[PDB]
Amino acid sequence: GFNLKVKDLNGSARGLTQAFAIGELKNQLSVGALQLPLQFTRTFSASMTSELLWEVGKGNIDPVMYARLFFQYAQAGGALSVDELVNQFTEYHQSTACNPEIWRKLTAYITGSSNRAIKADAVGKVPPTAILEQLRTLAPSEHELFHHITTDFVCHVLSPLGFILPDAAYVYRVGRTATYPNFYALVDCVRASDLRRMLTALSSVDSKMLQATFKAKGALAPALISQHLANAATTAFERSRGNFDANAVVSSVLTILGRLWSPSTPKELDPSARLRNTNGIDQLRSNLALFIAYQDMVKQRGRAEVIFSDEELSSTIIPWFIEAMSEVSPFKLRPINETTSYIGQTSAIDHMGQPSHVVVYEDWQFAKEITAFTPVKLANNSNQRFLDVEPGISDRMSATLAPIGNTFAVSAFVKNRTAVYEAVSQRGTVNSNGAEMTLGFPSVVERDYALDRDPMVAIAALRTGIVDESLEARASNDLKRSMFNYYAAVMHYAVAHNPEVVVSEHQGVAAEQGSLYLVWNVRTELRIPVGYNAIEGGSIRTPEPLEAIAYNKPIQPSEVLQAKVLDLANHTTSIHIWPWHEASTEFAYEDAYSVTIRNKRYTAEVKEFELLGLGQRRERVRILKPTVAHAIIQMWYSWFVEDDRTLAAARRTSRDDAEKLAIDGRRMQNAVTLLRKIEMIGTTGIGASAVHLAQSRIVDQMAGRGLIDDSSDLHVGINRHRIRIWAGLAVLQMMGLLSRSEAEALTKVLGDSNALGMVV
Amino acid sequence: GFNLKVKDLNGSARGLTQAFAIGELKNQLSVGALQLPLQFTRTFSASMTSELLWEVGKGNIDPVMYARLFFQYAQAGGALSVDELVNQFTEYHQSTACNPEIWRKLTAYITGSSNRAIKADAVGKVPPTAILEQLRTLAPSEHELFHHITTDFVCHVLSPLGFILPDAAYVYRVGRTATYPNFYALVDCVRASDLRRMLTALSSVDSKMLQATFKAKGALAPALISQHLANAATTAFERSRGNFDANAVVSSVLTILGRLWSPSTPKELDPSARLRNTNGIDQLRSNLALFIAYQDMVKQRGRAEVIFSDEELSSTIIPWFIEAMSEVSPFKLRPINETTSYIGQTSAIDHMGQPSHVVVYEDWQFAKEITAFTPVKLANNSNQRFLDVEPGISDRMSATLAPIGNTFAVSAFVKNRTAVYEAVSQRGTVNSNGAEMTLGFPSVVERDYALDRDPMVAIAALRTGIVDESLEARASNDLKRSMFNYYAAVMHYAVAHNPEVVVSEHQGVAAEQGSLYLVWNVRTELRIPVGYNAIEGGSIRTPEPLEAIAYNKPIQPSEVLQAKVLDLANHTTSIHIWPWHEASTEFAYEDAYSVTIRNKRYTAEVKEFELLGLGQRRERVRILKPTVAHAIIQMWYSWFVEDDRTLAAARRTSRDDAEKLAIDGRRMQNAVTLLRKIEMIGTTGIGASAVHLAQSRIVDQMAGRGLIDDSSDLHVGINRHRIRIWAGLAVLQMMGLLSRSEAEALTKVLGDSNALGMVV
């Protein structure tokens, strides 16, 4: 719901300027006239709308599965980066598997003793749960993943089928991922494929005959294999070397992709025609995600250095950069036509006419359900849980969720967004401060909400283009990451609709090297209010992906991009669990409706279980945070607030008396559409249940303190609208949909303009 | 012992107005003229007078027994609600039964080892107490019930007869229950039948062939059945699904019954002729308890919404609402004739005459015994106790108990209450503020005393109709629960003697729809002093069940309703135990008699063991609270205290000199009857022992401090009456019969009016 004035970008959105991303924040902006072309066929993007539960097998040690989960751990909630996550494992894998001391202790634990050795055709099966139980005390890692990966390693080498009872069920949640590959995200991919080869080494064609070596001649003396497996596992580890530094890998391959993108290819080195012949690199230089990645890297690094083992080495070794990106990563390769399918565009117009208001959107479908579960601990010290989903809370809310989807539908947003801007007798203009552009991108906003950050802090950073130097490492890094996903998503839509583009170097500030940027071209009608550009002949050249977009013509989105619920029901009921806590929330709410009647104030306080009509209260249950559903309402919220914010300061700067009466128009007008929307929600399964409770407790209070006859005032026009809005704000707050901090400022918007028509 | 003036109900007792219960507290009262008829054949009521000890078998897992006990736990003292008690268990049951880690832990403990697995036809039996001992350290739940249901689950599947020597005897107390079904109690019934199917799934034809599958071919390898039982107990769990929400069940079914109770049936949605034919709905729409429950729901919720799974679903599902109600619940179905059998009625009269005083009462019989037991702990950390009942303490008290019943008998109460109210030469009247009605209901009062609340606070809540918002949730929730039982008990009696009735909708407070209320018809004498109503034609229609009751004629109760003692003697002497502690009381008492003689003050202090004539003192023994016997005396107390209270504000507000001399008459008059009663108990096995001990220590004090000859004054008329009354209050307190706070307020009453005739 980010609204921006296309004329002044530096003022309106500094953060979305390409100019910003390449590192020129000065009044000088990228030059509309310069050199070399390119066409992007393909890119790397993750999936939207996927909530999946993935089992971890008996064995089998799936090397891609783990590597994916590692990503999901670093992504969906912060634990360091997948880079820092792997070398925590390597240190772990060394301290345990290569340590024969640990192998003695647990082989002793299975049966029967560390000293006594028995061939023992008598010994029966053992559960994986018992070995994991042992391992939590032996190698106390924070990330419990590590304990499963070693486990099913031993269970792969332990299956003559006698000793290992192949019965357990364990599941992990694969959720939404940030959509586009920031530079370090690529390094995370190379580093993750470092893990694939690492694990696919552990289960091997020689680990399978390791079973077959001890399958002969029968049951054998136990005491040996503790030292054996320890060395068996050491051989598998030493065989996989860190080798090429994953950072340096990405560093250089991008460096060279920039060298053949750039109009300045200096004398000394331009890529070999041999590495130019290397498979897929034709498809690599045509990759948009890799391009934006370059801009990022060179912004932070300010140089790019090469291992110089090429022209030969990385043409032969590695393409495996390609393999690293293709298989392991959540970012899998797509045709650029189909990456923007969920994006729509619509223009307002004047008489001639130029667009007054242009709105870009993602078609999203709301709902379907809101799952409510209660965690159950099987063993202390571990995050292992059954999640019993208790419905009837979920069903209750979900029924109340249905009307919200209809009334907040994105479809309805663009409608109520475009039709507002018109003023009496047209006529335009460059006046009113020009042609507005607003773009909702719930895909982005969900991310701030998943990481427990305020979407409004990133957005603020977009208009201004500066971040607070004070805040701590994990906070700014989360902000910068978020501030990126915006820029990225903009340039994919911008490019997919104008694939023909020009690459040009920059002078540089120093000048040291420079960053490569993009320029578009577009043909249109003659006279432009819109942000400065010629247009000189009905076609126009622009550096900024926003300008490129403002000039397109209305678009119908191809796909609906329906968000989906996680299935707790079918799986989790029988199964164990992943890092759930940071992804869910304690289910509790308190709110109070107060009102003054006849110069006396009554206050009713209300609780969540009272709102759902049950007793008494269950503190143990939690709600799975509905970040996507939340992000859509944010789009409404951020329009309402940020407009009122901008219109107030607009009225001060407007000296003209005829304009101020126009400004003051839009304010009250959209203040009431906000009111009419919430007030509608105030009547629903919860809303009416809420109003009843509030009113009910007030009258009981009015009965004791005095006469009841005052209750007639609750049925007056104004108090009825009052109580209703409150309910609406209360229902949204008690679901994952409205933060109290944001709903508080929502009320202020509703009150900053008086914004109540009594209207008979 | 609640007394009320039938003229003004709102003022005198608001809490018992139907108008209050359907939620109309405004000056407006229900309209005597409106539409549709109905007749109630049946109701749902609990049992009075039952103290039972229930043994828990080896196995066999009686699914109904446990589900009944859950109720008894949540009832007999508050632990949340039986709804919250159940999902504590389901969480427990996941933590234990689905967890193969724990099955391993205990099977290793029973036999023979965790690593080595031996079929072992040699290995012998183990006692259930030992497996339960293990479970107390493994799954440390506060409610020890859970350990038995799991324990004897394994003892059910473990009978090749080899491993379990299944020998122990454990018992639970099934006590008094609230008599009538509040709305959430119905929710509690559905949720308890959810427990029935839950457990009846556990013991199965497939869990026993589980024995029969492994009965072959003989003793088998141990390590296996550890992972096996876990999935076996798991399959049975996933097989019983929560499915339908218990709250949703009741909400919707009552809603539709209301749709066919009401004269207002909108075209749009009225019950289908198909679900109109659905079996049982005939006796359901004719069921009173459901109706008073309906009123409850709509007061608190303020709407009735339907799962709308009908027209189909509730004809097929649920009737199962009925099954939930039939077996599991303590509320089992009764014909409305036989529910009010213990309720009698009697009127006082004036000359013509209309009733001045009408008293409704429950016939109750006292005694027989008062049990005194000393707990014995077999193991720390558990509530398991032998309770050795040491009699001769019990017998000593019971002997003193026999006269108390005689002097406080309900029989005696109704006499001394009706025969007092007459005034000289009749004649009435509507003057004096009309025709009083008092109704004793020990059944209701005992609930407050079992739950360690002052019955007098609920009583307060009846007259005013407001609860203090200050007191904590559980407190008001106990208060509100109690206030329901009063209202409920009235309307079962009102209806049973006047079944022809009319249902009518109400204008509404919101107004959303409205609550259906009741109107009666009754035949009588010509001119009415009694609370406003037409009467127009020798018959009269009234909304309030109290007015309806006044117009009936004296009734003899059918059944005696004798209260019974719990038998500790026969069972517990050999057996372990339930939640006894909150249900018993530490046995210790201290008291002191003080008197001033010749401007000197002497005091003798007395202790409990001294009063029973033994030495030295045993602190370890406890008393089982006689909550019912206490509740009966409450009937007296609340008359004595609360009348003296109202007669005081009566003399102030009385200007008339002829009226005030009458008021002050009633006060001393019944004051002596209180006095004569207490003094009477003062002569008993204990009472006389008290007097002797007190006087003895005083004289012993008079020898040292000075001359003994002053002791002659202790035998004077006045000091003799003093000490006797004291002993009476002292004997009642040292049994469960008088709270010191109320015994103090009884003295204030006895002294507020001078209240001593010397009378030779």
Short mmCIF file of N, CA and C in Angstrom, two decimals, chain A residues 109-113 116 118 122-125 127-129 133 136 165 167 374-379 386-388 390-392 396 573-574 576 612-620 685 689 692-693 695-696 699-701 703-705 708 715 720, chain B residues 14 20 25-27 80-81 83-84 87-88 90-92 94-95 98-102 104 114-118 183-184 191 223-224 227-228 231 234 237-238 241-243 245 247-248 298-303 305 465-466 469 477 509-511:
data_model
loop_
_atom_site.label_atom_id
_atom_site.label_comp_id
_atom_site.label_asym_id
_atom_site.label_seq_id
_atom_site.Cartn_x
_atom_site.Cartn_y
_atom_site.Cartn_z
N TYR A 109 25.49 -48.09 25.15
CA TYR A 109 24.13 -47.80 25.58
C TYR A 109 23.11 -48.68 24.87
N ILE A 110 23.32 -48.98 23.59
CA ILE A 110 22.33 -49.80 22.90
C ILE A 110 22.30 -51.19 23.51
N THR A 111 23.46 -51.86 23.55
CA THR A 111 23.65 -53.17 24.18
C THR A 111 25.14 -53.50 24.11
N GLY A 112 25.59 -54.35 25.02
CA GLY A 112 24.95 -54.46 26.32
C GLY A 112 25.83 -53.74 27.32
N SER A 113 27.09 -53.56 26.93
CA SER A 113 28.12 -52.96 27.78
C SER A 113 29.29 -52.47 26.92
N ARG A 116 31.91 -55.82 27.97
CA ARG A 116 31.39 -57.11 27.55
C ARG A 116 31.00 -57.08 26.09
N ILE A 118 29.31 -59.40 23.00
CA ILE A 118 28.57 -60.61 22.67
C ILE A 118 28.09 -60.59 21.22
N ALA A 122 20.62 -62.93 20.11
CA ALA A 122 19.51 -62.67 21.03
C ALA A 122 19.02 -61.22 21.08
N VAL A 123 19.93 -60.26 20.95
CA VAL A 123 19.58 -58.83 21.08
C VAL A 123 18.48 -58.37 20.12
N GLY A 124 17.46 -57.74 20.70
CA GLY A 124 16.33 -57.24 19.94
C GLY A 124 16.49 -55.79 19.51
N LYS A 125 15.42 -55.25 18.95
CA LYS A 125 15.41 -53.92 18.35
C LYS A 125 15.55 -52.75 19.33
N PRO A 127 14.59 -48.31 19.41
CA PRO A 127 13.95 -47.11 18.84
C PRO A 127 14.90 -45.92 18.64
N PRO A 128 14.70 -45.14 17.55
CA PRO A 128 15.55 -44.00 17.19
C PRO A 128 15.42 -42.91 18.24
N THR A 129 14.25 -42.92 18.87
CA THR A 129 13.90 -41.96 19.90
C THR A 129 14.83 -42.09 21.11
N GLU A 133 17.49 -39.33 22.38
CA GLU A 133 17.40 -39.03 23.81
C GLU A 133 18.80 -39.02 24.41
N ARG A 136 21.06 -35.94 23.06
CA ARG A 136 20.77 -34.60 23.55
C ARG A 136 21.65 -34.28 24.76
N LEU A 165 14.61 -50.72 15.04
CA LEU A 165 13.19 -50.81 14.76
C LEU A 165 12.78 -49.61 13.93
N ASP A 167 10.53 -47.69 13.28
CA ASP A 167 9.30 -47.00 13.62
C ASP A 167 9.53 -45.65 14.33
N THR A 374 -2.65 -26.72 20.38
CA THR A 374 -2.02 -26.76 21.69
C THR A 374 -0.80 -27.68 21.70
N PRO A 375 0.39 -27.12 21.97
CA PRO A 375 1.62 -27.92 22.00
C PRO A 375 1.63 -28.94 23.15
N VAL A 376 2.25 -30.10 22.92
CA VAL A 376 2.36 -31.13 23.95
C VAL A 376 3.79 -31.64 24.05
N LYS A 377 4.43 -31.57 25.22
CA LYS A 377 5.83 -32.02 25.28
C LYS A 377 5.94 -33.49 25.64
N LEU A 378 6.66 -34.24 24.81
CA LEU A 378 6.92 -35.65 25.08
C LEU A 378 8.10 -35.86 26.03
N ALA A 379 9.17 -35.09 25.82
CA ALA A 379 10.34 -35.13 26.69
C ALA A 379 10.85 -33.73 26.97
N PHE A 386 4.04 -32.88 19.99
CA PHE A 386 2.83 -33.12 19.20
C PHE A 386 2.07 -31.81 19.22
N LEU A 387 1.47 -31.43 18.10
CA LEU A 387 0.58 -30.29 18.14
C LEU A 387 -0.83 -30.80 17.90
N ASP A 388 -1.61 -30.84 18.97
CA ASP A 388 -3.01 -31.21 18.85
C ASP A 388 -3.72 -29.95 18.40
N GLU A 390 -6.85 -27.96 18.10
CA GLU A 390 -8.19 -27.99 18.64
C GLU A 390 -9.12 -27.06 17.89
N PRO A 391 -10.05 -27.66 17.13
CA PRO A 391 -10.96 -26.96 16.25
C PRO A 391 -12.08 -26.41 17.06
N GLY A 392 -12.98 -25.70 16.40
CA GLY A 392 -14.10 -25.14 17.11
C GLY A 392 -13.67 -23.81 17.67
N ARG A 396 -14.53 -21.38 14.57
CA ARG A 396 -15.21 -20.17 15.00
C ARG A 396 -14.62 -18.92 14.37
N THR A 573 -1.19 -34.66 14.03
CA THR A 573 -1.93 -35.42 15.02
C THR A 573 -1.18 -36.71 15.45
N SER A 574 -0.53 -37.36 14.49
CA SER A 574 0.25 -38.57 14.74
C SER A 574 1.79 -38.37 14.84
N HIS A 576 5.77 -35.97 15.31
CA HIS A 576 6.59 -34.92 15.95
C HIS A 576 6.90 -33.68 15.10
N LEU A 612 -15.13 -15.75 22.08
CA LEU A 612 -15.43 -16.98 21.35
C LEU A 612 -16.50 -17.83 22.01
N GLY A 613 -17.08 -17.33 23.09
CA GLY A 613 -18.21 -17.99 23.72
C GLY A 613 -17.87 -19.33 24.34
N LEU A 614 -16.90 -19.33 25.25
CA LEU A 614 -16.51 -20.57 25.90
C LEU A 614 -16.00 -20.37 27.33
N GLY A 615 -15.86 -21.46 28.06
CA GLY A 615 -15.26 -21.37 29.38
C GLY A 615 -14.45 -22.58 29.85
N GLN A 616 -13.51 -22.29 30.74
CA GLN A 616 -13.26 -20.90 31.07
C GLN A 616 -12.29 -20.28 30.06
N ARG A 617 -11.01 -20.56 30.19
CA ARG A 617 -10.01 -19.95 29.32
C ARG A 617 -8.94 -20.96 29.17
N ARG A 618 -8.38 -21.10 27.99
CA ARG A 618 -7.30 -22.07 27.87
C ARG A 618 -6.04 -21.36 27.44
N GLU A 619 -5.08 -21.32 28.37
CA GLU A 619 -3.84 -20.56 28.22
C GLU A 619 -2.85 -21.36 27.41
N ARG A 620 -3.06 -22.66 27.38
CA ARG A 620 -2.10 -23.51 26.74
C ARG A 620 -2.12 -23.42 25.21
N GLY A 685 -19.53 -12.97 13.61
CA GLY A 685 -19.62 -13.94 14.67
C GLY A 685 -19.03 -13.38 15.96
N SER A 689 -20.92 -10.66 19.10
CA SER A 689 -20.67 -11.30 20.38
C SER A 689 -19.92 -10.33 21.30
N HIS A 692 -22.29 -7.38 22.37
CA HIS A 692 -23.19 -7.84 23.41
C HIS A 692 -22.54 -7.82 24.78
N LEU A 693 -21.32 -8.33 24.85
CA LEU A 693 -20.60 -8.39 26.12
C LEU A 693 -20.35 -7.01 26.72
N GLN A 695 -21.90 -4.05 26.00
CA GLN A 695 -23.17 -3.46 26.40
C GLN A 695 -23.69 -4.13 27.67
N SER A 696 -23.65 -5.46 27.69
CA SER A 696 -24.16 -6.22 28.82
C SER A 696 -23.49 -5.83 30.14
N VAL A 699 -24.56 -2.20 31.42
CA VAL A 699 -25.86 -2.11 32.06
C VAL A 699 -25.88 -2.73 33.46
N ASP A 700 -25.20 -3.86 33.63
CA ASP A 700 -25.07 -4.46 34.95
C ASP A 700 -24.39 -3.50 35.90
N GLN A 701 -23.50 -2.69 35.34
CA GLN A 701 -22.77 -1.69 36.10
C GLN A 701 -23.65 -0.47 36.34
N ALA A 703 -26.86 -0.67 36.67
CA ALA A 703 -27.92 -1.12 37.56
C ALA A 703 -27.50 -0.97 39.00
N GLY A 704 -26.29 -1.41 39.30
CA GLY A 704 -25.80 -1.31 40.65
C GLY A 704 -25.66 0.14 41.07
N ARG A 705 -24.88 0.91 40.31
CA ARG A 705 -24.53 2.27 40.72
C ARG A 705 -25.71 3.23 40.75
N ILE A 708 -31.07 2.25 35.71
CA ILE A 708 -30.82 1.60 34.43
C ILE A 708 -31.30 2.48 33.29
N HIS A 715 -28.34 3.22 22.88
CA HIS A 715 -29.02 2.94 21.63
C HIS A 715 -29.14 4.18 20.76
N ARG A 720 -23.88 4.00 19.17
CA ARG A 720 -24.02 2.75 18.44
C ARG A 720 -22.92 2.62 17.39
N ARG B 14 -34.65 -10.05 43.48
CA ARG B 14 -34.57 -9.77 42.07
C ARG B 14 -34.03 -11.01 41.41
N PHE B 20 -35.10 -11.46 35.45
CA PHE B 20 -33.67 -11.35 35.65
C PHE B 20 -33.00 -12.41 34.80
N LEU B 25 -33.76 -6.54 33.35
CA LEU B 25 -33.73 -5.95 34.69
C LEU B 25 -34.39 -4.58 34.78
N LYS B 26 -34.92 -4.10 33.66
CA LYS B 26 -35.60 -2.81 33.60
C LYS B 26 -36.91 -2.84 34.38
N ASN B 27 -37.42 -1.66 34.71
CA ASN B 27 -38.69 -1.53 35.42
C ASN B 27 -39.77 -2.35 34.74
N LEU B 80 -11.33 -26.12 37.54
CA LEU B 80 -11.79 -25.60 36.27
C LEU B 80 -13.23 -26.05 35.98
N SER B 81 -13.42 -26.67 34.82
CA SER B 81 -14.68 -27.25 34.41
C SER B 81 -14.32 -28.59 33.81
N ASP B 83 -14.82 -29.69 31.03
CA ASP B 83 -14.31 -29.46 29.69
C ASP B 83 -12.79 -29.31 29.76
N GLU B 84 -12.31 -28.39 30.59
CA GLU B 84 -10.87 -28.15 30.75
C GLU B 84 -10.15 -29.31 31.41
N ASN B 87 -9.37 -31.89 28.32
CA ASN B 87 -8.25 -31.64 27.44
C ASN B 87 -6.93 -31.54 28.20
N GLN B 88 -6.99 -31.56 29.53
CA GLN B 88 -5.74 -31.74 30.27
C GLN B 88 -5.33 -33.18 30.08
N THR B 90 -6.30 -35.35 27.52
CA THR B 90 -5.92 -35.65 26.15
C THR B 90 -4.47 -35.25 25.91
N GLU B 91 -4.05 -34.11 26.46
CA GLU B 91 -2.66 -33.69 26.35
C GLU B 91 -1.76 -34.66 27.08
N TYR B 92 -2.20 -35.09 28.25
CA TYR B 92 -1.45 -36.08 29.01
C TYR B 92 -1.33 -37.35 28.17
N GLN B 94 -1.46 -37.93 25.09
CA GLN B 94 -0.51 -37.86 24.00
C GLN B 94 0.91 -37.99 24.53
N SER B 95 1.19 -37.27 25.62
CA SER B 95 2.52 -37.23 26.22
C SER B 95 3.01 -38.59 26.69
N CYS B 98 1.32 -42.10 23.14
CA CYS B 98 1.85 -42.03 21.77
C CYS B 98 3.36 -41.98 21.75
N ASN B 99 3.96 -41.87 22.94
CA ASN B 99 5.40 -41.71 23.09
C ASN B 99 6.08 -43.05 23.36
N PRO B 100 6.77 -43.61 22.35
CA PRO B 100 7.44 -44.91 22.43
C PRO B 100 8.66 -44.85 23.33
N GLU B 101 9.17 -43.65 23.58
CA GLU B 101 10.30 -43.45 24.49
C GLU B 101 9.94 -43.90 25.90
N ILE B 102 8.79 -43.45 26.38
CA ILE B 102 8.32 -43.80 27.72
C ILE B 102 7.92 -45.28 27.90
N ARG B 104 9.32 -47.74 26.50
CA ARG B 104 10.62 -48.38 26.67
C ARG B 104 11.07 -48.22 28.11
N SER B 114 16.68 -53.27 29.60
CA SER B 114 16.51 -52.29 28.51
C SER B 114 17.25 -52.66 27.21
N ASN B 115 18.36 -53.37 27.34
CA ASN B 115 19.17 -53.78 26.19
C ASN B 115 18.91 -55.24 25.80
N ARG B 116 19.23 -56.14 26.72
CA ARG B 116 19.01 -57.57 26.54
C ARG B 116 17.52 -57.86 26.53
N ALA B 117 17.11 -58.64 25.54
CA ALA B 117 15.71 -58.99 25.40
C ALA B 117 15.55 -60.50 25.45
N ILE B 118 14.77 -60.98 26.41
CA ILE B 118 14.59 -62.42 26.58
C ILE B 118 13.11 -62.78 26.63
N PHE B 183 -26.22 -24.20 31.55
CA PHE B 183 -25.83 -24.35 30.15
C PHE B 183 -24.48 -25.00 29.94
N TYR B 184 -23.45 -24.46 30.57
CA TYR B 184 -22.11 -25.00 30.35
C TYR B 184 -21.97 -26.40 30.91
N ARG B 191 -18.92 -33.00 26.43
CA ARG B 191 -17.48 -33.15 26.50
C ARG B 191 -17.09 -34.41 27.31
N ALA B 223 11.64 -56.37 23.91
CA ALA B 223 11.98 -55.07 23.35
C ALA B 223 10.94 -54.58 22.34
N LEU B 224 10.25 -55.53 21.71
CA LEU B 224 9.24 -55.26 20.68
C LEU B 224 8.01 -54.51 21.15
N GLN B 227 7.56 -50.52 21.37
CA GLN B 227 7.23 -49.68 20.22
C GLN B 227 5.84 -50.06 19.74
N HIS B 228 5.50 -51.32 19.98
CA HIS B 228 4.21 -51.82 19.56
C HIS B 228 3.01 -51.18 20.27
N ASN B 231 2.15 -47.54 19.22
CA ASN B 231 1.34 -47.34 18.03
C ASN B 231 -0.07 -47.92 18.25
N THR B 234 -1.84 -45.48 20.11
CA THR B 234 -1.95 -44.35 19.19
C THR B 234 -3.06 -44.52 18.18
N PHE B 237 -6.21 -43.73 19.68
CA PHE B 237 -6.40 -42.32 19.93
C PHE B 237 -6.84 -41.63 18.66
N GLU B 238 -6.14 -41.85 17.55
CA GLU B 238 -6.49 -41.15 16.32
C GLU B 238 -7.85 -41.63 15.83
N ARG B 241 -11.89 -39.16 17.31
CA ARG B 241 -11.57 -37.79 16.93
C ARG B 241 -12.48 -36.85 17.68
N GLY B 242 -11.96 -35.68 18.02
CA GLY B 242 -12.78 -34.66 18.63
C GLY B 242 -14.00 -34.37 17.78
N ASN B 243 -13.80 -34.36 16.46
CA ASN B 243 -14.90 -34.10 15.53
C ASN B 243 -15.64 -32.82 15.86
N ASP B 245 -17.46 -29.90 17.88
CA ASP B 245 -17.21 -29.07 19.05
C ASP B 245 -18.38 -29.13 20.05
N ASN B 247 -19.27 -27.33 22.53
CA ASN B 247 -19.94 -26.06 22.70
C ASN B 247 -20.86 -25.85 21.51
N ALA B 248 -20.36 -26.15 20.33
CA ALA B 248 -21.14 -25.95 19.13
C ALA B 248 -22.35 -26.87 19.13
N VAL B 298 -28.77 -17.63 26.30
CA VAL B 298 -29.10 -16.39 25.62
C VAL B 298 -28.86 -15.14 26.48
N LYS B 299 -28.85 -15.29 27.80
CA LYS B 299 -28.52 -14.16 28.66
C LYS B 299 -27.05 -13.81 28.49
N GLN B 300 -26.22 -14.85 28.55
CA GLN B 300 -24.78 -14.71 28.52
C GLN B 300 -24.21 -14.45 27.14
N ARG B 301 -24.70 -15.20 26.15
CA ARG B 301 -24.23 -15.09 24.77
C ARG B 301 -24.84 -13.91 24.04
N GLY B 302 -26.14 -13.71 24.21
CA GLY B 302 -26.87 -12.64 23.54
C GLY B 302 -27.32 -12.89 22.11
N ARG B 303 -27.10 -14.11 21.62
CA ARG B 303 -27.57 -14.52 20.32
C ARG B 303 -27.58 -16.02 20.32
N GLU B 305 -26.66 -18.81 17.38
CA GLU B 305 -26.35 -19.06 15.97
C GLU B 305 -26.19 -20.55 15.80
N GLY B 465 -29.60 -8.58 43.12
CA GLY B 465 -29.47 -8.92 41.72
C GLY B 465 -28.19 -8.38 41.11
N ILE B 466 -27.21 -8.05 41.95
CA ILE B 466 -25.92 -7.63 41.41
C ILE B 466 -24.78 -8.32 42.14
N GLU B 469 -18.11 -6.68 41.25
CA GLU B 469 -17.23 -6.97 40.12
C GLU B 469 -15.81 -7.16 40.59
N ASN B 477 -17.64 -16.77 39.60
CA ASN B 477 -18.07 -17.97 38.90
C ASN B 477 -18.71 -18.97 39.86
N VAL B 509 -33.54 -6.64 24.91
CA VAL B 509 -32.65 -5.60 25.43
C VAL B 509 -31.73 -4.97 24.37
N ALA B 510 -31.31 -5.76 23.38
CA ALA B 510 -30.38 -5.29 22.34
C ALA B 510 -30.92 -4.31 21.26
N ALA B 511 -32.02 -4.61 20.55
CA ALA B 511 -32.81 -5.84 20.67
C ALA B 511 -32.51 -6.80 19.52
#
